[model samples]
Target: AAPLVAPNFITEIIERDLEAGKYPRVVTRFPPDPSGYAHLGHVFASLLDFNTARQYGGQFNLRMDDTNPELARQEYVDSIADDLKWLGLDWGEHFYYASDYFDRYYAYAEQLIRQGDAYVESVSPEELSRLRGNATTPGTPSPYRDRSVEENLDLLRRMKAGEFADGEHVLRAKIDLTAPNMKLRDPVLYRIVNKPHFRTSDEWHIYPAYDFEHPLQDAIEGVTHSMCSLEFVDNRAIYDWLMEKLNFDPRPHQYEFGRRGLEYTITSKRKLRELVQAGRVSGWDDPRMPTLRAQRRLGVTPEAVRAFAAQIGVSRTNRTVDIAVYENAVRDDLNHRAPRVMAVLDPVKVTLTNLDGEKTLSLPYWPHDVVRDSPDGLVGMPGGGRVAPEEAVRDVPLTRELYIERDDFSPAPPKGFKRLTPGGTVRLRGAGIIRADDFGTDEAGQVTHIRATLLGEDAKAAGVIHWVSAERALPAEFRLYDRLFRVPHPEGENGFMRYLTPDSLRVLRGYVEPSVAGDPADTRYQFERQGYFWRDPVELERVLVFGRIITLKDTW
Candidate 1:
């Protein structure tokens, strides 16, 4: 199969490569380290790697840059795989880890030592810092740089055999020290570590740094166009230098692209960890987090994520993306897929005065998917509608005591007010019309109780609202979590905490429809005129926790 030519920068590069006959096929790789939970930044990178591979009619490889065994964990690895699969990206059968190539990478390091291109340095940690200069200054080469290749090789071998203590000796590339580009100034190639590895525990004492391994791995894998974020814009020189040093075929060309960042969120893994470890969040996937798990729980579907990837497309310069754009995408996706449901978030006692006081009315909880015949035609729901797979909808119980929103009834209605106000007529969603007879208020001026009687359709009312049978309504707990930042640019010139929205979480007890019990995790629905929500699934005694997914109607 062949890819259709699309007009884009990456595609343009691929087109030129094809014209130049660089290779018969393209090769791309997504090398992520399993040190922390995958976030939206990872999503952006994965999307770029995957979509580019597909467009070039090439294969995408999943590689783990698991160099830091202490930080990389099996838990993160498993979750990363699950998240990628959930996002609908697949890499065909080329899964690899840097640990998988430990023997090969070590052998390559040995080649460098033997050829005098790399040497062992005995500088102490303090002296090593003094040797490496700042960006504005040039560093002095180690006195050991001129050591014979034989002595360097012997010292490196001893270091690998655990003869030297950690940080006592390090394998350093014999590159320039006073070079304008500081990274090229004799970067450390290998360091001694006794810590156990996740995959290969205590197999070797020496390990290659990312700079040393990444370029060589790309060369070995025959990667044609190596794409990475702009931070590596300077590292591209070393990446090319490594290829020149190694006698490898099919050299990979390094290209830099803009990385993704979002407003009111920290994409840096180090900074994000501070938020979790400092107790600002419960965990990486805390519903308030910007992690993919949080987004998934907050009702951002896979389709929406994919659409976001497509809409954001690709970039070459770094910048922050608006959170509202992602929110709107989620809303647009759910509006079409989620079924409208009747669930009261705030419950006030309502006496229907028409049904048996002891028994409940049997009403099938089904939304009328009413489709109008044509323009200017009457709307009608034919043969009822579809019941959600998650919901076990049953007969609506008939009871004189029902529950509605506390704000539904107001003694002195404001002008243009509809729904449950005094002298106002409104219909209970899917039920008969109701007239406000009388209501009771508490000291807080809250409508705690409302007595309403069923009114005829000819009562001349145009307002309708949602409610649940009082005796049949299911008691549910909800944690209405909002965005952490009060303003869109919370993380702007002022620090992130400056824009922190106080009391972002509101835990409330509400009476939802019994069908909510059957609501599966991550299943979304609009609570009638209320906003959309998803099941929380967090266990609480006699409490079904639901998360406020998103409001379809844009308020801000």
Candidate 2:
């Protein structure tokens, strides 16, 4: 069965082409420029191409669009593969680089020159720009447009042989002179690049431009549908021109989709780089940055990211998607997978006045309402493997002294207060009910301690508070991160820094039940009523740090 993909325009086009028997098989490719880390926008595009290819039983190619040696770095190239693998996208054996196809591109350029479809132009950068003209005006023909094919070929060969310095000569297609569409006015096909290429080095001095390279690369790889960003809508003219001039029998067709983004985040490579360079962010992979590496570090499951992409669906309009929608998907996925545990971020001491002996209470990691895989339930996993985790009873001790979240207590109750208050009763989670009788305050008038009375087992309380025994609790730190921007659209033309959220990250020292140590280090948890968190392997200041993935619910 086809995987029940929602009907989108691109898929409809593919179906029509397939029904008409246009090609033998469907092949799609994601050619990233490899200038930066893969962000959420890349994930959405990758899912579209990868899932579409998988649905039609075709091949997906991972190609590096590395024609420009200046921007493409080895680390950025490596980051893309790592990001795709973490997202569970397997490009398999189909991997390629544009730099590897440079030799073939030169042959095609020579073919164009021989046919008089392309010509070598020796014009200053300013003169070339003047000849190309602007939006509404038709361009003036370059003086070198009518050069003889033999002369053009000789010049092109010399240009490739490093006989000419950078910008002294360029190979341009002789397309149109009086066309209103400025892109059709003799677009440059090849340029002289004197710098050593990242992968190929300085063996070749001339590099093919992206507009000329894209179509050839796609056709050479047998890609039937070449999907790309909407910005390429104008560049499609050159793509088709080259394909038709070369007369590729089964040429790839180009499709354009608008760029998509999430609310309260910016995916612009330059803007993201500014944030990193200005020290506004910790680094490229900061948890708040929106890179796939950061999201993985923050404990967002790959399953959740794919689900979020599907829920948003494919579209041509670049609408700003709500951050809440993204957070909901993360919460929904974590709800089933993350086991429950108690963590007190802001601790307030509570001493039981009327209780005596201490005992260990067997706590269930999963609530009775949620479904599970095994009879033992998914809890206390020593390590992540194919084997399912067994239901393990984590013994949490109940002592005379315990710590609970300070927010769960109020000296003077509000109109709709449901948590603990002075002289009010509340259930102590898995333990018995307790009544707050009195409280002590520090010199700064902060509530420091609460004297509570242990109620009888039969007593019922309307509210429950999560707590950890002061004696058995493990000291841990919590990193709570929210949206980096306070507004949905922060990437204005300028002054985006003004919208930086005042409290994007808040750190707190807290404690958790010691049983969490028994579970796998990678285990994520719904920290009782606090939020979802994962134990980050990179501990700081000799303290174990748990990164708050998202709130249990959207309260922002």
Q: List per-prediction Cα lDDT, in the order shown.
A: 0.74, 0.85
* Alpha-carbon lDDT of model 1: 0.74
In angstroms, the error of model 1 at 513 is 2.7
lDDT score, candidate 1, position 222: 77
Question: Model 2: how large is the Cα RMSD against the reference?
Answer: 2.6
Candidate 2: stretches off by over 4 Å: 1-4, 134-137, 372-392, 540-543
Q: Among these predicted structures, which one has the highest TM-score?
A: 2
lDDT (tens digit, per residue) of candidate 1 on 493-516: 334666667777788788877655
What is the clash count for each candidate, in the order shown? 8, 1
**How well does candidate 2 score on lDDT at residue 52?**
84
Could you tell me the lDDT of residue 322 within candidate 2? 84
Q: Which residue pairs overlap in candidate 1's backbone?
A: 360-397, 360-398, 361-396, 361-397, 361-398, 362-396, 363-395, 363-396
lDDT per residue as tens, model 2, 333-388: 88767878899999999999887878889876666555454444444333443233
Q: Look at candidate 2 and give me any clashing residue pairs.
A: 376-391
